[PDB]
Amino acid sequence: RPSSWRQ
Amino acid sequence: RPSSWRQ
Amino acid sequence: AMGSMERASLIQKAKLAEQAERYEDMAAFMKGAVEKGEELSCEERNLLSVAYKNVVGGQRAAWRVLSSIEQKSNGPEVREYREKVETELQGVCDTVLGLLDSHLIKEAGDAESRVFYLKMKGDYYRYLAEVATGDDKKRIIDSARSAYQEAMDISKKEMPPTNPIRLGLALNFSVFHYEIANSPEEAISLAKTTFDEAMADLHTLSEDSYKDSTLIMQLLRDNLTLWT
Amino acid sequence: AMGSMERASLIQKAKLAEQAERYEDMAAFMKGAVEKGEELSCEERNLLSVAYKNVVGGQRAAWRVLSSIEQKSNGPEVREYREKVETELQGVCDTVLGLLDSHLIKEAGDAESRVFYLKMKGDYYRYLAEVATGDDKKRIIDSARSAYQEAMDISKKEMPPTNPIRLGLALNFSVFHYEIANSPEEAISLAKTTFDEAMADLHTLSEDSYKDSTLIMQLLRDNLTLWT
Ligand SMILES: *Cc1ccc(-n2ccnc2-c2cccc(*)c2)cc1OC
Ligand SMILES: *Cc1ccc(-n2ccnc2-c2cccc(*)c2)cc1OC
Ligand SMILES: [Ca+2]
Ligand SMILES: [Ca+2]
Ligand SMILES: [Ca+2]
Ligand SMILES: [Ca+2]
Ligand SMILES: [Ca+2]
Ligand SMILES: [Ca+2]
Ligand SMILES: [Cl-]
Ligand SMILES: [Cl-]
Which residue of chain B is at minimal alpha-carbon distance from C57? B6
Q: Chains A, B in contact: 3+ Cβ pairs under 8 A?
A: no
Q: At residue C53, what is the residue type?
A: K
Other C-beta atoms closer than 10 Å to the C-beta of C93 total 23
Q: How far is the CA of C28 from the centre of ligand 1 (A)?
A: 21
Whether C68 is in a domain gets the answer yes
Query: CA-CA distance, D155 to D217, in Å (whole number)?
Result: 16
Looking only at Cα atoms, what is the longest distance across chain A? 17
- D220/chain C closest Cα distance in angstroms: 29
Q: Chains D, C in contact: 3+ Cβ pairs under 8 A?
A: yes
Experimental method reported for this structure? X-ray
Could you give the C-alpha distances from C192 to C147, C163, C197, D122, D155, in angstroms and in order? 21, 16, 9, 59, 65
Give Cβ neighbours of residue C5 (< 8 Å, ≥ 6 apart).
C13, C32
* C22 at interface of D, judged by CB pairs closer than 8 A: yes
Q: How far is the CA of C87 from the centre of ligand 4 (A)?
A: 6
Whether C144 is in a domain gets the answer yes
**How many Cβ pairs within 8 Å bridge chains C and D?**
58
- The protein residue with its alpha carbon nearest to ligand 2, atom 10, reads D164
**In chain B, residues 1-7 whose CB comes closer than 8 Å to chain C:** 1-7
Q: How far is the CA of D56 from the centre of ligand 2 (A)?
A: 18
Assign 3-class secondary structure to chain C.
CCCCCCHHHHHHHHHHHHHCCCHHHHHHHHHHHHCCCCCCCHHHHHHHHHHHHHHHHHHHHHHHHHHHHHHHHCCCHHHHHHHHHHHHHHHHHHHHHHHHHHHHCCCCCCHHHHHHHHHHHHHHHHHHHHHCCCCCHHHHHHHHHHHHHHHHHHHHHHCCCCCHHHHHHHHHHHHHHHHHCCCHHHHHHHHHHHHHHHHCCHHHCCHHHHHHHHHHHHHHHHHHHHHC
Q: Work out how many domains chain C is built from and give that number.
A: 1
Q: Chains B, D in contact: 3+ Cβ pairs under 8 A?
A: no
Closest to D30 (Cα-Cα) out of D71, D2, D72: D2
* D15 at interface of C, judged by CB pairs closer than 8 A: no
- C185/chain D closest Cα distance in angstroms: 33
Burial of C209 (C-beta count, 10 Å sphere; 0-12/13-18/19+)? middle
Which residue of chain C is at minimal alpha-carbon distance from D12? C77
Contact D127, D93 (CB under 8 A): yes
D42 lines ligand 2 (CB under 6 A): yes
- C224/chain B closest Cα distance in angstroms: 9
Task: For chain A, give the number of residues.
Answer: 7
Whether C42 is in a domain gets the answer yes
- The protein residue with its alpha carbon nearest to ligand 1, atom 10, reads C164
Rg of chain B (C-alpha set): 6
C164 lines ligand 1 (CB under 6 A): yes
Number of H helices and E strands in chain D, helices first, is 9, 0
Query: CA-CA distance, C128 to C134, in Å (whole number)?
Result: 11
Atom of ligand 1 minimally distant from the CA of C119: 1
Residues lining ion ligand 8 (Cβ < 5 A) are D 107, 109
Whether D1 is in a domain gets the answer no
Whether C2 is in a domain gets the answer no
- According to DSSP, residue D135 is labeled T
Whether D114 is in a domain gets the answer yes
Q: How far is the CA of C42 from the centre of ligand 7 (A)?
A: 35
Taking contacts as CB-CB distances below 8 angstroms, the residues of chain C near D84 are 25
Could you give the C-alpha distances from C113 to C46, C90, C105, C119, C151, in angstroms and in order? 10, 24, 8, 10, 10
Q: Which domain covers residue C130, as residue numbers?
A: 7-228
* C94 at interface of D, judged by CB pairs closer than 8 A: no
Whether C139 is in a domain gets the answer yes
D182-191's contacts with Cβ under 8 Å and 24+ in sequence apart are: D184/D227, D187/D223, D187/D227, D188/D224, D188/D227, D188/D228, D191/D220, D191/D223, D191/D224, D191/D227
Whether C1 is in a domain gets the answer no
Query: CA-CA distance, C187 to C145, in Å (whole number)?
Result: 13
Give the angle C43-D73-D56 at the CA atoms, nearest 5°: 80
Closest to D224 (Cα-Cα) out of D161, D171, D152, D153: D171
Show which residues on chain D lie within 8 Å of chain A, measured between beta carbons: 50, 123, 168, 171-172, 175, 178-179, 216, 219, 222-223, 226-227
Least CB–CB distance from C62: residue in D9, D22, D77: D22
Least CB–CB distance from D216: residue in A1, A2, A5: A5
Please, how many CA atoms are within 13 Å of residue C156, restricted to the half-sphere of its CB? 10
CATH number at residue C46: 1.20.190.20
Burial of D109 (C-beta count, 10 Å sphere; 0-12/13-18/19+)? exposed
Task: Show me where chain A is broken: residue before each gap, C-N > 2.5 A.
Answer: none
